[PDB]
Symmetry: D2
Subunit: 327 residues, 4 copies
């Protein structure tokens, strides 16, 4: 059987605005267009909010799921992208901060489930893009950063274990993401995340392997193959993302399709998500995007360059072509 | 005949301090150690200085070459790494700024020659790491950045042509480097540099292809092969650098050796440089280096992790292994 | 004595081409006139160099709209600043020439609004603290050495601007601004030294009380500086502003010591300059204070509104001036 | 009246364990004593929480070295600040407890130096302007709302510190600091409001003239505030500093209006606080002014040296105090 191919909503946005009724229409029109190219599911980033609004968020996303269902999209699956934040930091040295971070992550597990989702992924250990500094604002890197991170990882392990026990009841697999040093202080490599997981009893807490992050920071195809086989053995290879090194066009890139996908397809039968970060205001600065935007039909004025749908269609075509070569 | 393998001094420093007599001893001891691993040449970054000191710089680097010769290193070849700066910007809209940038680049061509070098490479078009901003300090990215860059490239083309005519007299090939969007606004891709070069008559002005930059921003092996063949046809493939995506250990990485080197070895017979950026103060922040430092014997205290020489030795071993596979 | 007020109570951009905003501008003027204000300081937002003729048309149309709304007698001064691009202190002649053309455009806009006084940081680009090529800051003695070259570069450009401004009947009032906002000129002593190399007396000084108090040399030295500027025919404008740039009626502005030497020699307008906590200034001026809420733009609250503060500003200014005369 | 001077003329770190630096410290004290200074304000550089006992030993050894060099009678006050980590205003109890332990350590260090006055920004972390999780700045009304929670968090911690400081005979003088340097408390009115929720009168105020002038409500309101603090037994310390933090003898410090209400109720030391253009302050205070060069550290030049400025500072302070009394 041919695998399910999903696409990330980072082609359009970092905020689903589940309460904005006019925006829901835009979400549904994108999904219907994308489905015609063969996409069977979508990754929804869950924008962070205030802790007093957890119940209201759950209600809004429940209403978004119901609206998608009422539009004929019952069979469409959703995965979520969720990140720890400077405030909602489970690796904090302060117990109350960690507990507040756990409640934040439990809320996001609830939203994932309300969307019918069975996969919640992202940088849920160390806050995304929050490179640590001294009290006098001096950066902390290399050896000093690695010593600092040991304490953060020790702080977070029991919190992630508790979140795993909770997510298991909810039937949501937790897929922690190794992300490149260019974007976040850690975990950057699959070796660093594997080391973190040794202190988390719950197998509900596993990994997402994203090809862009693996190529930018990983240890090569031989070591990678051993890590893939280990994760599948442990029952911790929860999700897989295909994304080029520049995070843009998937069909013109140095993504090592054969070397990356061959070991994964042997042991993983879940969905493969196309994760393309469009040059939208949320990413131009954080990802240093010098490339032109894949203009979004109806939002952006048309131009002579490829549009968001052009790129999405070529992305699924290349992914299927390359998957077919491995079979 | 087996190709010459060079290594970059970015393993140790961004400043050769040609006038510091005690530092020369350190430079020579590194070179002698590295030669034992099989390295036949070295890339020396040329740190920028004040325009009033051009003549003094030429004299100092001439004295450095003579000191290397007096230490038995006559046969050791040097290439240089040189970058345009915010001040010394040949893409400026202001004629005097461009002329002052040309004199800066001519000085660096002179230093290259005084070091016996026949290759000067680097980000010599747009100032390295100087992402443009509005007068009100707002960043400029994506489509807007690409429109901005057309004017900068038009400003720089006649200046680079004049520098090529000068370098040809000096017997120094100029190798402009496509560098990842993570580090600089442009040129990021080999397609962008090829477009720039269409407006430069002088073939003395060509390219360096660095595998780390090609993988991070390039268009994949099929388009890359066409670009390699085009450059060699034009007589503009002046230099080649092997560097992993994370810029660290060359032997444990996703560098696509076969796909990257196969088209190059067919048409290029120059030196292949190992370019490893050690986690030294000059790079920890600019390259966001979360990895531990390859400690430098005698400078840094020893530790249990790999040292600078360990990494250098493994780098040449892997490069030769992979080159042998292509033959 | 005519008392004016800055539009920095509301904005940094007069949006002269925006027909809806013109009504807002007129509304604010009519309200502030009832408090006794006889003129207004309009900041001139910078733009693209291809649009100078259109800018002139837009501001001319704004002046004519004010006139048609019964505001013929309302006077206008302008606030203009050099920018990183439009820098007359640049080492590069074409950059200085482009800076000169920008400032000449702004002189034409001032004149088109009936203005006789264009003021601001027109020598060194406002808030552009210089850095090395490696983005390291330059301060103190190293900065002062760096500024000698910048000042030398700008002197001839300001003189040419002066000659042009004299023709258009617009006085140029260069502003010493605190070190907290800009690298220089920060003190009246630095500006005086700069002006020694400028022939055109059309290029003078604006004295802002907030900047004088923050960086100045005290009341004894200040008196002597004020007397000197009047002898040089270079005291072109005066602004009253408290140290925190907010409420003028509850501040440490040294009214007596600041106004006494000035009122002996100066009979131009005195401008109230209050920087409200609007988005253009909250970060740049580090404003921890609550906004003086703008009626019909901001929702009301228990704290003072923009008009409350503006009314108290003119009342205290009048009171203190009366104590001197 | 005893006149003290801050070591911010030279440093932010007394390096008490550094035997070579101790000689430098003693050298500076002996030189400044000849001008009439009877005491010194020592900033206490923060460190790691595992080193509190060693810090206490180092500063105790420094005090004993001064004593052995004939400086038994030299008095010392300390300058201490909360930090992003050691924040008593944190929402997290363990963070507040760790902040409390840091401040208690610093009370022990003050006492070990013979100090009776520990002062500074010990409520909200100095210069740590709060941001959203996306690194967006928080200013004005939104910041003031944010500070209500921070202040509420800190009140009980400062009260416990007060109880501890009373035992050790060290008065705690919290400092209103300008909005240019820190998010709060910026004004004496904000600090007064904070102190309403603190039971311990050992926790009081330092009034710094530079901060009062930059952010304060003027001489009429200030008099009333000074009278109130004296009635509350909370005016623990006074510092004289010009607005630009440099030369005290050529500035807009309003000597009469600032000192008159204070001298009626306060008879503690008056500290000259000059922040020299040293690397610790050039960027943080945006110092465009030339350094007051430090003899034997900096090469000489034609401009005033650190001692020249310090001598003129005490002379003007004495002169102005004499004008009042
Ligand atoms: O690499 C991207 C990350 O997934 C981040 O943007 C949201 O978690
Ligand atoms: O990618 C690195 C560049 O070569 C720069 O550091 C010097 O030019
Ligand atoms: O002191 C303020 C300045 O004048 C600036 O904001 C406009 O020029
Ligand atoms: O106003 C200055 C502050 O007190 C700070 O630098 C030391 O606490
Ligand atoms: Cl906990
Ligand atoms: Cl806690
Ligand atoms: Cl966005
Ligand atoms: Cl030119
Ligand atoms: Cl020019
Ligand atoms: Cl370095
Ligand atoms: Cl010129
Ligand atoms: Cl605004
Ligand atoms: Cl507590
Ligand atoms: Cl210092
Ligand atoms: Zn991803
Ligand atoms: Zn390179
Ligand atoms: Zn002003
Ligand atoms: Zn102080």
């Amino acid at each position: 059987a041919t695998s399910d191919i999903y696409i990330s909503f980072f082609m359009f946005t970092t905020n689903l605005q589940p309460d904005n009724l006019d925006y829901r229409r835009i979400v549904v029109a994108h999904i219907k267009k994308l489905q015609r190219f063969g996409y069977s599911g979508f990754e929804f980033p869950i924008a962070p909010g205030l802790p007093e609004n957890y119940a209201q968020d759950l209600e809004n996303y429940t209403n978004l799921r119901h609206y998608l269902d009422s539009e004929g999209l019952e069979n469409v699956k959703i995965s979520t992208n969720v990140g720890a934040t400077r405030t909602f930091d489970p690796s904090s040295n302060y117990p109350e901060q960690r507990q507040e971070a756990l409640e934040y992550l439990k809320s996001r597990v609830d939203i994932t489930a309300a969307l019918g989702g069975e996969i919640m992924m992202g940088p849920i250990v160390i806050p995304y893009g929050v490179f640590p500094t001294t009290d006098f604002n001096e950066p902390i890197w290399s050896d000093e950063l690695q010593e600092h991170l040991k304490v953060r990882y020790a702080n977070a392990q029991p919190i992630l274990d508790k979140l795993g026990e909770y997510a298991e009841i909810k039937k949501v697999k937790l897929a922690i993401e190794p992300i490149t040093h260019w974007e976040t202080p850690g975990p950057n490599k699959l070796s660093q995340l594997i080391e973190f997981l040794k202190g988390v009893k719950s197998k509900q807490v596993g990994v997402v392997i994203d090809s862009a992050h693996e190529i930018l920071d990983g240890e090569g195809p031989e070591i990678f193959k051993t890590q893939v086989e280990y994760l599948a053995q442990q029952g911790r290879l929860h999700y897989v993302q295909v994304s080029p090194p520049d995070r843009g066009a998937l069909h013109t890139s140095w993504l090592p399709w054969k070397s990356f996908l061959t070991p994964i397809v042997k042991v993983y039968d879940g969905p493969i998500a196309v994760e393309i970060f469009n040059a939208i205001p949320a990413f131009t600065n954080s990802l240093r995007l010098t490339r032109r935007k894949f203009w979004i039909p109806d939002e952006d004025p048309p131009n002579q360059y490829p549009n968001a749908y052009d790129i999405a269609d070529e992305a699924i075509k290349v992914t299927r072509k390359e998957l077919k070569k491995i079979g």
